[PDB]
Structure formats: C-alpha cells, structure tokens
Amino acid sequence: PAQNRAQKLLHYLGHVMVNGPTTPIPVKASPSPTDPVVPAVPIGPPPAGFRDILLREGPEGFARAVRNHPGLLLMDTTFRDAHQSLLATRVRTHDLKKIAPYVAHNFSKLFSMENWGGATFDVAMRFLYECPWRRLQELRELIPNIPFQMLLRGANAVGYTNYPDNVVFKFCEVAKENGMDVFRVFDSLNYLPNMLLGMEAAGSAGGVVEAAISYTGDVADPSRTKYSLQYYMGLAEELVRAGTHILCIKDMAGLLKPTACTMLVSSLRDRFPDLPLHIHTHDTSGAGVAAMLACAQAGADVVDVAADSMSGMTSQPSMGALVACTRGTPLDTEVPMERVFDYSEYWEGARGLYAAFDCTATMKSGNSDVYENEIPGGQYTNLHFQAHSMGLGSKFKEVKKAYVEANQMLGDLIKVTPSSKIVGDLAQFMVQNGLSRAEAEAQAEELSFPRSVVEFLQGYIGVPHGGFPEPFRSKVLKDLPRVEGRPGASLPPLDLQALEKELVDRHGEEVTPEDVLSAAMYPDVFAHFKDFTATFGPLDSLNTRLFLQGPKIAEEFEVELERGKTLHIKALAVSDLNRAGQRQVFFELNGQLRSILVKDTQAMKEMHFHPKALKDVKGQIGAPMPGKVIDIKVVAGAKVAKGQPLCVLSAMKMETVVTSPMEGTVRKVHVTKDMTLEGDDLILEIE
Amino acid sequence: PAQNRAQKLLHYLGHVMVNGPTTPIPVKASPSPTDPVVPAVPIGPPPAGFRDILLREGPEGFARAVRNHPGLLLMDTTFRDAHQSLLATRVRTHDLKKIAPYVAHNFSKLFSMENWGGATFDVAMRFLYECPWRRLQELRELIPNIPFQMLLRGANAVGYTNYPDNVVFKFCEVAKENGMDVFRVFDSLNYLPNMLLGMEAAGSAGGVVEAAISYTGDVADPSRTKYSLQYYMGLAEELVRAGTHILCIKDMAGLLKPTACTMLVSSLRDRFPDLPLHIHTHDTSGAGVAAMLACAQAGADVVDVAADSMSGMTSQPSMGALVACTRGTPLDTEVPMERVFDYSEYWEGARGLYAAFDCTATMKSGNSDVYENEIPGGQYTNLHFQAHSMGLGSKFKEVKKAYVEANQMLGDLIKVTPSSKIVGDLAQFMVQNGLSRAEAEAQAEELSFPRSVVEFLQGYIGVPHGGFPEPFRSKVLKDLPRVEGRPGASLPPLDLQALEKELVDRHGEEVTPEDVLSAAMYPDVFAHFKDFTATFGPLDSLNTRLFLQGPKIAEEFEVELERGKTLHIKALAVSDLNRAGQRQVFFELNGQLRSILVKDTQAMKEMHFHPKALKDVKGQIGAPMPGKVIDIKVVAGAKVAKGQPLCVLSAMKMETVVTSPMEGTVRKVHVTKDMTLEGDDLILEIE
Amino acid sequence: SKFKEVKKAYVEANQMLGDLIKVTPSSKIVGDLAQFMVQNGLSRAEAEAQAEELSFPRSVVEFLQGYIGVPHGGFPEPFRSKVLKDLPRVEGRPGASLPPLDLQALEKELVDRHGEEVTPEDVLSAAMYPDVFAHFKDFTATFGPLDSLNTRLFLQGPKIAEEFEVELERGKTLHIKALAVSDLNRAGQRQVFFELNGQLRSILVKDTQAMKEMHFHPKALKDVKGQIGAPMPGKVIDIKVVAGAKVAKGQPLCVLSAMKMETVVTSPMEGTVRKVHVTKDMTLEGDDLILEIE
Ligand SMILES: O=CCCCC[C@@H]1SC[C@@H]2NC(=O)N[C@@H]21
Ligand SMILES: O=CCCCC[C@@H]1SC[C@@H]2NC(=O)N[C@@H]21
Ligand SMILES: O=CCCCC[C@@H]1SC[C@@H]2NC(=O)N[C@@H]21
Incomplete structure (x- = not known):
C-alpha cells in the first residue's frame, strides 16, 4: 500500500478550515500565533541521572540512592498533572518533544519526570488523536537519563472501569518495556486490595513501586476523626509491609497545611527512617510552596513541582520558588535558577497555544475555599466547564456547596479520579433538580441518580473507608446487583490473543x-482513534496552532514528517459548496497546486425538537439531561413496573438509564434510536 | 447657579458613545457586563477596632496595643497597592464604597487598611476624574473603626518632585483632618534626611508615624555587601532614634526569601523588643506567603495581605492563605475564613470590570526572575505597557536584562517609585538605541539620557547610599546644576493663600x-481635573462599566446622584455627523426624551508626517521619541554649541530636552510648537 | 416567459368567444381566457371540447351569462350552453331588470359611518365602487390628504436627512425633514423621527416586513380527480361545503378572490367531501389542496 500522509494531512487542514476545530473548544480564546522559543541545548549525550542508577542497581538500589541524597530532590509534573490541571490535559506530543532535550541536559538530577498516566492516555487518543505509547517512546529516547513516572490506578491502570487482573499486569509489563520507570500506585478510596494488585503488577514488571496514599481531611484538626493521623500511619504500615520502594502522600486538592505537613511527614519519617518519602500537592489554596517547604523540613526526600509558567492555581507549586527558597540550606536542590527561567519561558509561550483550554478563563488565582469543598485541581476545571455546558455556570457557587453536601451524603470518601467525578455529578444533579441533601436522602428511592453514583454504590470502584452510607445505598440500589470485595477479582481473564486477531482482521498486520x-x-476510543488516523494521518507532525485552528488563507508553513522529509504547505482558497455538499480546498504543497474536497456540515443546519414533559404529569417521562438515545427498552402497549428501565441516554460520556417513576402501560414512545434530546424532552407517556 | 448634573452625566455618556473611553485602555479586553455582588452587612454600627484605641490613647497608645496583641495582626492593602500592582491603580471610589460597610463589620480587628498611598492621588484625578480627598472622606464614614493607612514619600508627600517643607507639613495636617491615621513614611533611596522630614510632618499632624525601610538585595547572601544586614540595622537605629511609632520593612519587589526574613526580623526584634514590626512584601516570586509566615515566626507583629482575588503575582500575599496557615497556632489572626471568601468573591467580580487594565493580559503568574531584575510590582506592569507602546514589546526580555545593567550603571540604588522608573527609562533607552552598559558609560558625554535619569543624577530625588556613580554622573551632567543635600530645603515656602485666591478667581468660591x-x-492635573468635572459632572456616581465603555443602544440603567435622587437613563440612538462635526445622542431620562450634541474627532482624524533624520548625517537632528513639541529653543541661522538645548518634547509624561550633538549653525527647523512627532522625525538641520 | 403564447391564445380566445369587439371590459374577458388556456396547456379545440368540465374565469362566465350586453352576431353556441349549464342567463339589457338604488338610504348609511x-x-x-370607496375613506381617515405630497414622496417616502415642502392650502406650507427610524419595539412598531417646521416630532408605525413567516402545506395530485387544487393563487373568501357533505358535479365548493375577481371553485365529480384543508381568509398558491372528494 502506497503511503499517502501528505494528502491525509492536507485533508485534515482542509477539514479544519471548512468545519472548524475537531477538538471541542470550551472557551472563545485563540491559540498564540507565535510558536514557543526552544532554549539552546548542548551538543552531546545528556549528563548521567537517577535513571542510570535505576538501570544499574534496580528499584531497591534507586530507592536507597534517593534516601541517601543530600538535599531536596525535585520531580517535574509539568509534563503530566500540571497541564491536566491547567489546560485539560491538552498538551501535545509535538510541544513536549521540542523541550525534552533541554530537560535531559539541564535537569539530569530530577528524581523523576511525571509525563505519563492519569488522564493523558485517554485524552491523547480521544481529543489529540495521537498515540500515548508513541509519546512515551519518543520522549524516552529524548530523555535517556531521567526516570519516567506515571500515575497508575491500582486495579484499573489508566482506565475508568475495573479490568481483569491479566490486563493490569500486561499493561504494567508493556509500560516498563516502553521505558516507564516509576509507578505511582494509588486508589481513589485508598482501598488497599486495589492498591496491592497495582503494586504487584508494577513490581512484577520490574518497575519502581511508589505506593501513594490519597490525602483528605485535616490531620491537624482534632475534630476530623475519620481521616486522622492514625488512619494515615496504619495505611502506611500496610503499604510498607506490601513492599513499596517509595511512600507517596498524594494531596490531590492542596489540603495539606504547613502544620499538617510537619505532623504527618515527621510521624512517617520517625516510623520509617530508611524509606524514601515523596510528597505531592496542588497549589489550589495558594499555600502549596509553604506546604512543600514544611514537608522538606519534616524529612520528605522528594516534592512534586511544575515549571513556573505551568505552576500555581490548580497545578503544583512553582519549581523556581522551591529552588530559590532552599538555596544555600541543607535542603538545596542544586538546580541553577537560570535553567528554571529558560524552562518556564518556553512553557509560557507553549501555554499561549492552549489559551482555548486554560483554567484562567474561569479561575484567575488559587482559591482557599478548597479547604471547605475539597475539589481536586483537575475536577475543579472540569466541573466548571460541565456546569457551563449545562446552563449552571451562573450557579457554580451552589454547585460547590452541593459538592460538600454530596461528599457527606456519599460518606466523606477520598475525592480523586473517579470518586471526585462521582461527587461532582451528584452535586450537579442536586443543583439541577433544586434538591437539598435532606430531600435527596429522603427521596432516594424515587430519584434517578447519575450512573457514576449508582456504579459507586454498587461497589464497582472498591469499598470506601468506613463502608457505604446506609440506608442511602440500599434506597438508591433497590434490587440492583452489588459487588462484594475487589471488582476485578470476579472478572474472567481477557483473551488478548483473540483481541489481537480481531484488531489485525480490522486494521491490518x-x-x-x-x-x-x-x-x-478503551475499545470505543481506540476504534475511533484508528478510524480518525486512517483518514487524517499523523497529526502529531502538525504544530499545535495548525492542529487546533488550521491555516489561514495565504499562510505558508512547514511540516516535518520524518528526518529530512519536510512539507512546504500554503493554503490558497476554499470554494463554495458543490451539489454534493462539499467544498474544494486549494493548497500549494512543495511548489505544486493540490485540491481536496471536504464536506461541510455547518453549511446547512436545520434540526427540530418538539417533545416536552409536563412536570405535574407523573406519566410524562422527560429526558433527565441533554443526550443521545442509545437504546429504547420499551414499546407502546408494554406494561412497566416502578423502577423498570425505559431508555438509555448517552450524554457527557455517561450512559444514564431512564427508569419508570410509576407502574402503568406505555401509551406512546416519542423518541427514536440515535435521536438527540434536550433536557425535559418527552421520551414517553405512561398511563 | 442652577446645578446641571444629570445633563453633564448624559454629556459624558454621549461623549463615550461617540469618541470611546476617556481613560487610555492598554489592552483589548472589555469590562464585565455584570456588577459585583455585595455581601450582606449587619444592620448597626460596626464593632470597635484598633482605631478606637488610636483615637482614645494617641499614636503611642496604638503602637503599644499593636505590640501587646496576641497573634499576627493583618492589614488590608486591597484598597491600594493591590490594585496599583494588578490593575494600574484604576479601581474607583464607586467599587471601594460598595464593599466598605462589609469590611468595617467583618474585619474590625485589622491593624489598618491601606488605601491612600502613592499613585492613587494622581491617578484618581488624571485618569478616573474623581477627587482623592472625597474618596478618603466617604470611605472613612463607611469604615469608622479601622485605622486608615497611606504610603507617604518623606520629602515629596504623594507627588513626583520635591516640594517646599510647608506644603509637605500642610498636606499631612489636612490628610489627618480628613481621617488618615497611619503614615507609612518611606524614601525611594532610603535617604534619611527626606524620611525625617516626612516623619516630622506626619507626627506634627498627630498621625501614627510608621518609618519604612525599602528592602533591596539579599541579607542572606554574604556576597552582597552594599545592602547587608548591618545596613538595615544601622538605618533602623536612626529611624527609632527619630521617634518612629512602628518600624516597617518595605519589600516593594518580593525579594525577601524566608531565610532572609528570619534573619532580618529576628535581628530587629532582638534590638527593639518593644517596637511594633510591620512587614510589607509582594508575591512577585510566588514565595510571598512563605516569606510572611517566616516574618511572623521571627516576631513580626503585622504583615501586609490582599483579598485572595486581588492577591498574588505583583500584588501582596493572599489574606485567606495567611489566615488558614496561622489558624490554631500562637499566630492565629482570629479572622473567620467564610468572611475572607465573601470578600474575595466580591473582588473577583469587581476585578472583572477592570479586565482592560489587568496585569494578567501580560503576566500569567508570579516570576522568580524578580530575584535577578529586582523590578517592583507596579513598575513591572507599567514598564511592559510602555515597552509595548514604544514597539519594544517583543524585546521585553532585553528590557529586563537592560534593567539589571541600568541599576548597576546607576549604582545599584533601591528601586521603588520614582527610582524604579528612572532605572526603567534608562533600560528602555539602552534597548531602543542598541547600547550595552559599557557603550552607554563610554559615550555618556555624547548621549541624550532620559530626563528622569538626568534629574536623578542632579540630586533632585536625594542622595543614593554609597553616593552617585563617578565618572558617569559628571559625564552625563557636564555643566548642569547639581543639588547638594535635601532638594526641598533650598525651595522657598509656597504661598498657599495666594494659590487659594488664584483658584477662587478661576473656579469660584x-x-x-x-x-x-x-x-x-499637581497643578496641571488639578486644572485638567476641574475643567473635565466642570464639563462632565460627578463621574464617581457612574458604575465602572458605564464609566469605561458607556451604555449600549437600548440599554437602561440607574444612577444615584444623592440619597433618594436616582436617574433612570436609557440610551436610544446616535445620529449621523452634522455640518458642525457633531453627532446628536438621544437618551430617555426619567421617562423623558433628552438629546445632547457630542463631537466625533474619530471621524475626521487625519494627519501627515513628512520629516526624517538620516542616522549617518550628524547635522540632522531626529526626534529621540514620539512626543509633542512643547518648546523650540532655536531659530534658523542661530549658532549652537555642542550640548545646547534645541527643543523640548513632552512624551510619556516626561519633558525631554533635545540637545545639539555638534557645534554649528542651524540651517533649518522642520517642527512647530504643539507638533506631534514620531521617532526619528527630523527636528532641525545643523551645518 | 410565455407571453408570446398568451398573445396567440388571445387570438384563439377571441375566435372561441365569437370575435367580439375588444375594449374594457371585453378585452379583459378575452385576456383572462387566453391566460387560462396557456396556464392549463389548452388549445382552442380542447377548451371547446371540454367546455362542460372546465372551470372558466368569472369574467368569461359573466360575459356568457349576458352581464355586459349581447355581442354582434349573438353568443357562440354550443360553447355558451356548455360553459353555463344551468347558470342564470340575462336576456336584453342587464341594467333594465335591476331595481332602482335608494341613494338617500345610501347617503344616510354613509353619514352614519363617516360623519356629516x-x-x-x-x-x-x-x-x-362600494368596497373601494370604503377602503379609500378608511385610508384617507388614517393618512390624510395624500394629493398634497409630490409623486416621489408619495411612492417612495423621504430619505434620512431629506428636507422638503408640503403645501396643504394656500399660505400653509409644512417644511419636513426625515431624521431617523428606530429599531422594532416590543409592540412590533418602529418609531420614525421627523422635524416639522423646526420641531422634532415622532410617530410609531408598525412593521409587517419585520416578520412575515407563513407556511403552505397543501397540494393536489393532478391524477387524483377527487383532490381539488386551487386553480389560482388567491384568498379564500367563502367555503360552501363541509366534511361529510354530498356534492354534485358542478356544485360550488369555495370562492377564491385573486386579481380582483371572485372565482367559484366547482366540483369536477359527484361524491362525498372527505376533508376540507382550507379556512376563510387563507391565502392559497396554485394547486394548493382545497378539499378531498370520495
Ligand atoms: O470529558 C470527559 C472526561 C475527560 C477526562 C477527565 C479527566 S479523567 C482524569 C481526571 N479526573 C477527573 O475527574 N477528570 C479528569
Ligand atoms: O503614565 C504615567 C504614570 C502613571 C503613574 C505610575 C505610578 S507612580 C507610582 C508607581 N511607581 C511607578 O514607578 N509607577 C507607578
Ligand atoms: O388591477 C386591476 C385592474 C385595474 C384597472 C385596469 C383598467 S380597467 C380600464 C382598462 N381596461 C382594461 O381592461 N384594463 C384597464
């Protein structure tokens, strides 16, 4: 088969010129017209770093070298969890690769760089249309000397549901083969059985196991008894007994006050004198720099930081602030400040390309209300964008209050992905329906809760500390199936050879x-990603502005496909609509005229949505959210029981089962499969 | 005379609809369409505060009460220097008054609120067209219980030049009569003779004298010998001997590292156990919260903070962060966090009205390069806007490097207004002319330096620590007059009764x-302010959006002139241009049609700019900056000596004398009085 | 685009009608028939052969009834008998059988409705001209003496900033300047601003062009004899039948008023009216479905 990359790229550029951005843009901001300036890099291999120790001496040798290091070690999250928090994980492989050689040379003493895990895996395929594995591989070649770190969920890997154990093990194996070094293993509820599986999978792959305790509450507040200092110490003892190489405290929201830092970290050091202590926080409160200095003074060996232009607010504390504050102390990081400035300078330019995703569109600074609401950095940005998309943007203060109430109703569980989303959906549901906590708990048998909340209460994410809230769980679930113990333990092993054969039969050899x-x-995401890249080719070769907005008429630019294969492209014109609903886009490619035909959907728009459900008529079932009808479970003339499934809506990437509020006969169904509904659109009538 | 306020306001609104904003807008951002939500205030008088102690027991009683306070006292800079830094001092009296009753009730324990210092005085009259004294009086009425604080320059009051002593004394007297309580007395060079006059003037008025030492350098760096710990201790001893009630450390740039905080503040406490210590910083580095916590732990009694939405970056540290971090410690501020959140929320909304002036248009976060460049918060924002206006915006990195070089060339003086501007002009001049420091020092006899640099070298701002840089000063000044000692001491007393009579004759009784x-x-500013308010009336009555952008067609709004006198105004239409170059604007006012005639310069605005100076022809004198010709000192046929004044240009609010580079005969003058010149426009020819 | 065919059909229509003198209104009668023939693709022969089945324009029917007098040589037979069927015929002079109009009773009605x-x-x-005169009095009651305006102002109105004079009576001139037109208010009106004799005056006038929005669903299948389409664009004046009514061939079904001519739409078949698709005052396009007959 003849490769057609250049034509596929011109087809993408022509598609963006006719139809607009293929990635959903949350705010009316434009990418910077200027590409970021890459700082000068020395000619040669980078200096030896902590990876060279890991490769020579294994995970235990690496952990001893970290503990024995004189000073505060630093780790870079800019690559992942700094943008996850600030720009909705939209930073692409293109921009990461440009600065990678500079990082390798000037930051060779970093403990690790956390460029993988979390939301980056799904987001790369679904929204950036790039392979997360290729990013890892390319970056590994670029940074041969710094350990790569990922955020791993213990029994779910990087996914959103539980997987059979053999998938989690094989994922950690192939991640290590592809150059992942450190696995930060966490659970969204600190549910030890999920963490142990992820630790065993990462350790069996030959990775550095970093067991991460998710922090919530306040250990310095004696009124907060559920998540006390004793809770954290007891969980640390179980994770150390399970053979963790490094112990992490993951403060996903920025709740660790300097006094709580001092108390928790000193207690952990006193208990575990030889174990490396890694502290992760967010600067959401504007106190994250002070919190990390207090951790370092209390005997933390490593702290998470971001590049200064990618730090603060819902991101990590500033790297330059920590380096400057520790300079000339026993905690000196030995990082030259000039190198931090050049690094932040590149990201300041690069962040300008992502203005369309920047959290500063909605949040101008850190906010101390995080000590009340406990909303994690990445969840705050997402919950605001969701609230705005649902017309609740003016009520976002009510959504934050309902988030506290929803956390309590759910039982004050740790709030990190996906548990932070479960609390967020419940909070939006409460505000959308005008329901206080007491009303939502009283009516729990009558209300149709968000799927995530239902799946949580069924046990699909593990068991929360202190157990599930009763009688609330029993009221919501009724007769719905319950998962006891670890959800992955009852799943049959996935046949990966049968899946490989199915994929070869579909996409080729x-x-x-x-x-x-x-x-x-991610079956549906991967299928869509392969179909999209089969149509549009290697989109990772485009600069971020051209990827997001396409070229302007008469704009000229270069695209490097491979070393020594540059495309000189100029956009010339877009035609009027032809009789086939297509517009012809004209380009110059390497001094030659080229034309591609792309269909325009925005050229003509005309839908109609008549149905409406009277709120006072219990038999009229309205759509509980804007969404697409996936499935219709009933027909006209069918008898239905109270709580019986009627239809399945797929909105905001969540199947919601619409259930009957009464017993009766379905008089009429007003919807079809694949129909798009607005809120309150009449689904069906019951008599 | 019949009052015509409503018509004058409609004339302003019609003027803004036809001609655009009367205040210069630096960035293409629009004010928020929504006014800020004012939090609920209790009905009654506010609780007793530190002012009640000051009024009962005088300045020494107040200072003892501050020292004896258990915990860390907090002061609010949001009213001034929080916006001075973030929004170019553009916050108006309208928005300050709306939140003032909430501040009085919920923050009654503040040490002080600092709203009258520095630029607010000039900016209120020149750009907001409001009386700074009326702001002070109104705010005092709404906040009877919290001490008001101002930033006072010692021998210059709030002005830009030195004044006769009787003007500085009379200013402090009338400021105290109008309800100013605390005078933060500083000098831009820490020049003790200027500080002593300001301390004596503030003390003689019956104000609380707070002597402020401006911080530069690093006391924790043993390589920095000029501004050592011994320098600060020696100056503190002289200011304490001079009878300061409170000693302030003013870190105008955010240079105080936590180690330097600990060392400086403990040394000051150990030497002065009974004296209140007040620490001011900026969060420019992102370390300001950690710096203020270190000061409080080292025995500071008071720290400067801003409301959270008005904190960080070039502003003060976050109030909510300091309150949260000190909670339940011996340094607890006793401020309820819920009250800080409600205060921050209002400001977030209010800051949205000033989006057109927000430093976030140019700086997305704090920057640690401040430890190298030592640029103060308000100077950073101004220097960037100036660099962009001069076409140097893409070279702002070169301007920051040239700022370090200019500081060294000038002798590493303290950098705060106006010395921070003097270094800034020199840095822009060096970058504009492509000069290194060595070239600028070598050519110092041939170059025409910025007036501010010349006036500094003459001694018009006082004497820098270590003296002026020689031979550089002697080369720049040549035969220009030098001021020895204190510049105000040689000025004759101003006849304020003669000035009052002149003002009564020109403006009425x-x-x-x-x-x-x-x-x-501020003679020219005050004259312009009186003429503007005589034309347009009380603009402080308008909300900030209507002040900046005027009303939209069909927009309806309310204007309260006085208690129980509301104007209901609706904008209806704008006509085409009449034969007199005017456009008729139609309003409804209290249900009645009203029309005003407003001119539109924008329509007919044309001009021509022919002159140009060949760079290679020494006899062709080009304009060194865009500016207006104020004065022409020479005629065609005049003999001119090298260095002789040729013309005076007035650009960027700075008279620049253009001088002859050679001896010769003026062949031709190409410019006229009031002519606007671009850069390099030919002024005259010399043979 | 078919005006050449209309001129040819005018010759054919004149002959079919009997070559009568052609002046108002007989020239219009020939013109309607010619347009009807071209619109329906009919030759003279086909129109004469099908004369019992076709719904001719009203002017042609009223002519054949005798309402304009008797043509030289008499009416064309059998064509007249086929078109008229059982329709009443006027013999002799049409005005001679009309009762005298009571002009004093009419004067009193007009005084009661328009004043003294x-x-x-x-x-x-x-x-x-009862309807024209009524409309003329209502229009001039609203807008006043329009004969005082020059033709350009009468047809197109004034431009913005245009100044002009209007003489109402000898020595009573009104200098008038148009100043502005506002946006649409919540009542569907736009405020027009004038200067009148140096004084600003404002009038609120409604705009229909602001939002016309109509829908036209009905259509008559040409092959379905029971589907009765509108024979011309027109307004429904009257509906003579209801759903469930038995109708005879040639029975009146509705009255359309288009081009200043009431056209009676008649049944092409005997049957039962299954459904009526039109309402009184409804505007129809050509071929819009009026009703169904089974
Ligand atoms: O739009 C759909 C969701 C896109 C991913 C959101 C990520 S999943 C990791 C992180 N945790 C959350 O709760 N949200 C973000
Ligand atoms: O545009 C002209 C200057 C406007 C005032 C600038 C103020 S003066 C106080 C502060 N210090 C500076 O150097 N700039 C600001
Ligand atoms: O638009 C409707 C008819 C307007 C009058 C037409 C006149 S009546 C006198 C003359 N004879 C005709 O056949 N037509 C014109």
Missing part, C-alpha cells in the same frame, strides 16, 4: 501489543 | 484646602 |  492494550482498556 | 493642596502638588 | 361631511359625489362613488 501493523497491530502492536500497545494497540491491543489500548483497545482492551 | 467652592475651593477647599484639599483643592489648594491638590493644585500645589 | 358626505357629499353627492361620495354617494355616487360608494354606489359604483
């Missing part, structure tokens, strides 16, 4: 083990 | 002592 |  694991964790 | 002092300090 | 300024000229104008 170029299917890799990484493709099989991507399909195993 | 309503001239107040505040008007006389405003004219004495 | 009714003249003998107004009575005769109403007697000859």
